[PDB]
Design a protein around this ligand. Structure first.
Ligand SMILES: OC[C@H]1O[C@](CO)(O[C@H]2O[C@H](CO)[C@@H](O)[C@H](O)[C@H]2O)[C@@H](O)[C@@H]1O
Lengths: 65, 65
């Protein structure tokens, strides 16, 4: 794209409360870091590390319904 | 909110209409590519090459307020 695209340069260090998260997306593969961005129920966006167990677990849960 | 950072990975190929732009900013030094972002009246964030004459001219005009 010739528009900006979001990248993550820090990850949240501890799990967000699951119940506060309603969506996720992956940042572009063009970014220097892989990242998951969780979207909260107050529509905040939070960067997280795909390598972490809780992150993969949250993703699996979000795809379950 | 958001802890993502906007980055640019391609530049618009032709000059944006000057009339459509309401401000600019430089992308973060965290991003791998240097870029100017022109923000349009409808809030597009368009990436532009800081080396191009039209980009520098537009910046200079925005700084004149
Ligand atoms: O139009 C969608 C998309 O394009 C950007 C470009 O970075 O993000 C994409 O990057 C990768 C391609 O490397 C794709 O996974 C994916 O479509 C996007 O993350 C971005 O402007 C836009 O989101």
């Amino acid at each position: 794209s010739s528009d900006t695209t979001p990248c993550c340069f820090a990850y949240i260090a501890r799990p967000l409360p699951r119940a506060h998260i309603k969506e996720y997306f992956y940042t572009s593969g063009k970014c220097s870091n892989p990242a998951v961005v969780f979207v909260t129920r107050k529509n905040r966006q939070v960067c997280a590390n795909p390598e972490k167990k809780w992150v993969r677990e949250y993703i699996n849960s979000l795809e379950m319904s």
